[PDB]
Amino acid sequence: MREVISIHIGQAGIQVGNACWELYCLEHGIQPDGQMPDDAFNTFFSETGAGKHVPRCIFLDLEPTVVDEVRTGTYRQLFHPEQLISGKEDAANNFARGHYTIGKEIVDLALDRIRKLADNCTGLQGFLVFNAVGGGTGSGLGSLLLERLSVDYGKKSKLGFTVYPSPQVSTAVVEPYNSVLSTHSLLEHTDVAVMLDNEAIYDICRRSLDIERPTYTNLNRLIAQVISSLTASLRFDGALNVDITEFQTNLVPYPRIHFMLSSYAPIISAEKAYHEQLSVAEITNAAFEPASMMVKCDPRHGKYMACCLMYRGDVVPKDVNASVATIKTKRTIQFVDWCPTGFKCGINYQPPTVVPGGDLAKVQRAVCMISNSTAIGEIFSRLDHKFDLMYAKRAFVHWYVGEGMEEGEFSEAREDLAALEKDFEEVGAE
Template identity: 40%
Template sequence: MKELISIHVGQAGINIGEACLEQFTYEHGITQSGTFEPQDNLSSSNSCHTMFHESESGSFNARSLFFDLDQDKINHIKKGSYKSLLSSENFVLGKESSSDIFSRARCIAGHSILNECLEATRKQVEKCDSLEGFIFYHSVGGGTGGGLGTLLCEHFSIDYNGKYKLSNAVFPSPDISPSCVEPINSMLCISYMIENNDLTICYDNKALYRILYEELYQECPIYEDINRLIAFNVANVTRSMRFGGENNCSFREIKSKLVPYPMLLFLTSSYSPWTPKEKAYYYNYSVKDITCQAFNPNSFMTSCDIRQSKLIACSLNYSGNINYTDANNALSYMNLESPFKFVENESKKLSVNINPHTSIVNPYSGLAKTSISLSTLCNSTGISSIISLVSNKFMSLYSKRAYVHWFVGEGMESGEFRYKYENLRALERDYVELEKNHD
């Protein structure tokens, strides 16, 4: 069994970390005090070693690291429900704040704790027999999540060359933005991610709020609810790595299937059926139902419509008692009703995996456990809409040099903005080219 190390950076990263601990302890039958108490036949003690390290005394510790420049979130998780699964080796706290500025987090405040973060990582890596890679969790628009997150990713590319890095990145929402410098932070973060990440799953809070509100009927969803959806998605993506099975999908395979062009590593994800817990008994879904729903724009965790754009590649991960004939029939039906548009004129870019076990739903999530479900990972030109949103908002500030002096005084040179922005423009152009070609 391969191991995965989770790296939680900044507020969003750490908050999602707590949701991940809730999801993964539940799935693997680990109690809050770190003992193994299997809940069902899936939770074999072997499967939990991907995410948890077993100490000599037999208790389990999470293979998770929490890095931040503000103490609030770190202190919260240190004292929280999962404190017994963590020790001082799982945390690094900075000495000065980023003041929300990417360059300050990356070049000054983050840089001063870089060695501690690398050392904490080295200790986790030492506890692994066969490390698969790192899963990062962070926001794109936060100073620390973006700045320190990308700095670490860059160092891991050198220190752990050949190990895969998957980012779960919260992108700025189209119309919810808590900080005036978010577009600048986001532009810089995306530009660094293009250079150093293997795969990035994009989320935006607007899309996630909509799922909670419209699909799961939660009246006042908060970050905690959103974060449970992100944790659930990561659980679905990593399920075969954790539990094994014939469709054991490593990061290497995901990357080779979904990322044919090196810069276009930004993925979006959907799930179906998004059914509220209290409605579980009203519905009896067919494979066709869940397949059609999974491609509905409302099922995606990013605000983009992939049916109106072109698919570069997509993996469909079914769970439950489903056979390949039913899955392929459902896809053919969809294709007849409204043909998939691919960047090239061929339809071999949909890969189907079937895991015979049903998805494991965290009882606090408000989501119903259903006998069959589908989780997708899509590489689509539609994702360019959230990249362009960042790039346009950045340019409208940068053209007036708004806030630029906050960054230049804090570790960046003014020329770097242009250079980093060019990376984003090149990415946007690649998407436009793919949209145009192969019609």
């Protein structure tokens, strides 16, 4: 009834969707077969006459391997076969390939299934698009689909949980190129874009989870827990319910500035669990710690503009107010002069469910801090030099040109990220 349509594009999108849907199935009690032994699942699942609940999700990818892993995995009887959409040729880390030549038919079929899915929803709170800025499928096809949704669906709230490349560590070479292109695209389509960095989540797993060998499964589990914390107010009741439509108005000062840091707390393994108090004040301070940011961007360089806190579990409103008042009186945390309030608290009575086989511990309290802060322009500043350093020699440019792209598009994307730099500088300024 408060349905949100889930879209997962590219390898990273689909692989974080794996963890997300495992988490949602565990949270609502839905077995992998499709049915469970009120109406809290309607946000993520549509129940059929036979009792089988099918998730309102769409797995879009131009490479068949990742989707076939889902088709053969434990969740083969849960997902809809036509909802899993598989391409023939991968985008090959080419934004032009994923946005101009291969992506057209796939996105047409994607909008077909998305229209069918949205028909089965009475209301529609919005879309949750999980993709990977830094690869052709994520960048190109994701940008194309976001344009499609923005134009046709229109005023539905699209939350893009994008993963940008890390400052130093990376796995692709044209990753600055396609990242700049997809940021140029999604600056104008998504309503709230959640920033993620693999380096930051790796550091989180290394220090807090004590995982010396973090992997994509752990990263995606953490991301899934963050998104479940985001959506807990849609599916479970609690004091200070926060809505998907409430997020933007409470968090977006200006149309372009909608990129948001996400930070979960606590991140503690079972062995370290139940050994500290993990009170509301302590978990709030941990959430505001610079290291807890899921993006390699120090909050101290910038100033917070808005901070939306999602509390899950046994949280009392005086405790949230006392913790946040201590945060305001803290000297390290600095807000802009023009947003004296800058805080959007929302509590929920459902503690975060734990995935068996994971490292996260069963904690009766959880906080997801999603903050709009002017600091995040630093990551765009990094990519703005990573891009132009290669573009000066026009390396790998012919690959993008071959699939229907032009020098003007590269130049315009660089211009637009420079514009975003100036926008962050200006929101930081008095």
